[PDB]
Amino acid sequence: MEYRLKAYYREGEKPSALRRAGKLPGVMYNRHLNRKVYVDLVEFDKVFRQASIHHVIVLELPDGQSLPTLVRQVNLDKRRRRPEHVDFFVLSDEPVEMYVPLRFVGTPAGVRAGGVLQEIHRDILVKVSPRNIPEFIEVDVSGLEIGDSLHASDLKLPPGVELAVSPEETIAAVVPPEDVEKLAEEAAAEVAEPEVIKKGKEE
Amino acid sequence: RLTAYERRKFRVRNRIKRTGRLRLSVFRSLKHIYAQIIDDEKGVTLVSASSLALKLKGNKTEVARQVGRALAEKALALGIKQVAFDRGPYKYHGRVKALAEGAREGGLEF
Amino acid sequence: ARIAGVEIPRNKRVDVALTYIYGIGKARAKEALEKTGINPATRVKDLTEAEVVRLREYVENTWKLEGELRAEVAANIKRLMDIGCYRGLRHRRGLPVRGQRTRTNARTRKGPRKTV
Amino acid sequence: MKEGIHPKLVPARIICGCGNVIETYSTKPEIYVEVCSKCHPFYTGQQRFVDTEGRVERFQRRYGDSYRK
Amino acid sequence: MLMPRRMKYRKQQRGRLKGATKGGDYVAFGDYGLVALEPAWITAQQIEAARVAMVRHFRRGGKIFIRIFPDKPYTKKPLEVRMGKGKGNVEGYVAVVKPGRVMFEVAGVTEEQAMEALRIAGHKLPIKTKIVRRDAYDEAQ
Amino acid sequence: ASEVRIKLLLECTECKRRNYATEKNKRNTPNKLELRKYCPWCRKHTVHREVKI
Amino acid sequence: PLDVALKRKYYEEVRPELIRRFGYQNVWEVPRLEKVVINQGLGEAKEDARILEKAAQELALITGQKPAVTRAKKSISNFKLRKGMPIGLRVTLRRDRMWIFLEKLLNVALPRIRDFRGLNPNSFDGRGNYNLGLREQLIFPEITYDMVDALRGMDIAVVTTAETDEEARALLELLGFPFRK
RNA sequence: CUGACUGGGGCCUGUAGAGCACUGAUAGGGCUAGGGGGCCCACCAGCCUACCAAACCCUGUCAAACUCCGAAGGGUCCCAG
RNA sequence: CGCCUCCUAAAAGGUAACGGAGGCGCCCAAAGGUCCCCUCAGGCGGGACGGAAAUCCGCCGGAGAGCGCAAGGGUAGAAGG
RNA sequence: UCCCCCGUGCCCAUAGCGGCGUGGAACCACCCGUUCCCAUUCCGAACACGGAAGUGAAACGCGCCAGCGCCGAUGGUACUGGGCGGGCGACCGCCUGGGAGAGUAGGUCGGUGCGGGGGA
């Protein structure tokens, strides 16, 4: 789907001021424009959790414009785990590199055997026209076992959308589960004490 | 990645420039030999001479000898006297050596 | 390294130096020199260069020798080892192949005595 | 070429047993041989010296067919 | 248990614990993480205790990700000695951990299973923790 | 300097005065060093020979 | 330069068949011989009889060119090897001597090889160069059984302007290089 | 009148922070030598591995004696108070 | 217990502890002066004896080699051969 | 003064790797030879000399491609000079001035000085 978001312009307000008014500081750019924006933090969050960096948000700018953007960058407060800034990349009619979700289809057999579907990539970075964003890219993982894997080479892509990461890059894998019946061997596991690396006339 | 030609050119020419004298640079092709005197601080050529210029004859060694006197002739008329001989990637021998001996015959001090 | 792939000694008679070629014994020595009419008693030194090339040509073209003799005789042994026949089982162990007893002796095919 | 260190190459007459004369260059003005390219079995197509055999085994035995049928 | 296979030096100086995490602050592998709320040296024994508790709750199934490694050698003088006469003997290894870090992630398990295993794990650790779910903010990192 | 690596004087072969002190490895250079050095009495260069210190 | 059957055979018979077989559009694109390198990797005359001059005098007769010493870049415990020790010979044959050597090689030397099956066709550099080995030195006409003592072979590099194996196989086989397969 | 301090200007720096390009550490995954294990073989090669795992890569990290980066400041000279 | 190198040392210099790590008490007659020439380690492919590694050929390869010996700095446009 | 080539510098990869295409009148290479000066721990490969049939194949030069490599904002953050607070502490905040690195947008298949040869 296609989401919307009121956005506003800023000039000399301080970010800390904005963030205590419940507003999330931002920036908008492409090869033609660059503008300091903000978006009401509660309204942004409700949009971003649905529309990560895959689907389009159109920013209803207060000057009457409405610009089609992808979120390009979200800076988090490493301490508090909270969005602290957004990059809004304003789309044009030319292609773009973006992330598109991977939608893992089917139930792996090595998962039925007890394994765990390790989904190394939940999206793939893929160049595609903006008039042409797929909702996702289905992936058949039903025939994987322990420890089989998929790669971007096995990605069957829809029309008008080309891989922009190396197809040799693993995307899914099925590993063995955690098992208690290994604890006793791992607990009774003598460890050779660490080795310093020889310095001087010894090497 | 440099050649033995490029490292040589650099090496002899780095030592020449350290002395700070005007350098009598010589270029030598399969056919012609070219010589210009260069102020490295202003990065400018002061006076030139070549077999291609004067349209000199045949035997490359005597041809190089005459471009040397010719380089000298105009050189001294411009106040140039002392100089440093830049053999670049060339061994001081034959053609390049003939240009030197002729340039000295003119009165270039080196 | 003249004939025939080997270099037969001088200072000796041809017939006897021809034995010093894999594939030629006394018999094939007195069947070569007679065919190309060179006295068997003639010393390899005193060989005429025409005599030599007549001695070369006969033995090199009528009989399998040196390399190629060693070649097939291996394949003969190779194939017995592969078709799983009892002569091949004795080859795949190094054991005597021609009926001999093995309680004692058989030191030629076994080599020196492996103690215990 | 440096001088004093190199053995002179001169016109040379090689001679093989098959009457082949090579108009080459060498350090010995006249060398013999017992073989040359003009006679070697590998070179001369397949002058299969002796055993142009067929083997003849392992079916060519055929001594004989007189067993009953 | 976890410790460097080998090192360039046997004894690190103590250093400080000021500031928020350098990195490791977003869920990067699994579905739920255990985030550190205050700084500490996390010993290897603590890390192992928290792991074993998570596999023991999972009984069989799921996958534990450990995103902290104890590489700092921890030193202690023998008991009842005076100061001086050189640095004490390395007696263990710790992972410096600062506010924001995701020490452990889990995958392959029900929400109740991850919330619970991660809770039990927290109790083994010398600090406060929160339990976080892989977010879109995490994906955007 | 050690037992093998000795200290030694250089004596001007002409006027015979020692003008220089140096060292050598008498296992590596077992022969008496001969060196052209400047002699300040002769006031010219002269061969100097190693002479016991 | 000298008149040599091989050199002449290159220009008259080998050059135009190559143009044919590949369709070059410049005369310099056609494969040429650049050099042949011979190297007795002796390694036996290290601390043993360092008068390997016996083989230097041997190669000088084969090539007509005095080979140069090869010495070790490092010491090696297991080879009894010390840095700088003489361990072989190398001689770079070009032009007329390269042609004259290959001529006798393809004519006389290769056939005298014990149980000659032909050159190993999968020994092409990958870059369009070729290398072969030898286990003896009597293989050549200039080394008579009398004057020789020990058995030493050599390594041979035949370097070509051809960029590929496929082109280089064509040049060498056209010149008369007997390939087993 | 040169001083502490201060203005402006130049030059020197490798810390805080950060980073992983080097030297080391490092969890997992991919890949892929060498090993361990299993079918098959001793006739020399094969086939399978939810086993340990080199090197490479990928995601994610660590370091007083790591640095592709790199502040604030600090130092010093000139002119000015 | 003197001397050298690194860190601690808070980006000038300096800075302590019975703080963390290593070295020196030599050596070279060339391993010194100058002139000339030369360019490594390593990886892939190829080559008798010949291997992980001896020597040879090709391609890639800015310096990860080398610089007598610790460590640091420096360094192929050489201080290396 | 305008384009092309040849020298020789400056900036110091926005200048590189790779791919493609193009250039021989001129110039530059290779080239043609090794008598001669000179040269090879062997080799006219290199260095060097005398040449001028050929070729732009190699090298060089010039365009073009962003796969790599290199360069890279803006915004926000870390850190911080100076000034203040808080916590039992490990530590955490605020004011003022400064302000990264990573990353994002994006840039780049060089720019320029001097002399010489040719071209209008």
Ligand SMILES: NC(=[NH2+])NCCC[C@H](N)C(=O)O
């Ligand atoms: N503006 C400054 N100089 N700040 C330095 C740090 C101040 C204070 N300790 C803080 O954490 O906020």
Ligand SMILES: [Mg+2]
């Ligand atoms: Mg929120």
Ligand SMILES: [Mg+2]
């Ligand atoms: Mg030349």
Ligand SMILES: [Mg+2]
């Ligand atoms: Mg016999």
Ligand SMILES: [Mg+2]
């Ligand atoms: Mg402390």
Ligand SMILES: [Mg+2]
């Ligand atoms: Mg503790």
Ligand SMILES: [Mg+2]
């Ligand atoms: Mg402690």
Ligand SMILES: [Mg+2]
């Ligand atoms: Mg102490």
Ligand SMILES: [Mg+2]
């Ligand atoms: Mg202690």
Ligand SMILES: [Mg+2]
């Ligand atoms: Mg402990």
Ligand SMILES: [Mg+2]
């Ligand atoms: Mg942390």
Ligand SMILES: [Mg+2]
């Ligand atoms: Mg707790």
Ligand SMILES: [Mg+2]
């Ligand atoms: Mg031609």
Ligand SMILES: [Mg+2]
């Ligand atoms: Mg091959």
Ligand SMILES: [Mg+2]
């Ligand atoms: Mg080639």
Ligand SMILES: [Mg+2]
């Ligand atoms: Mg012979």
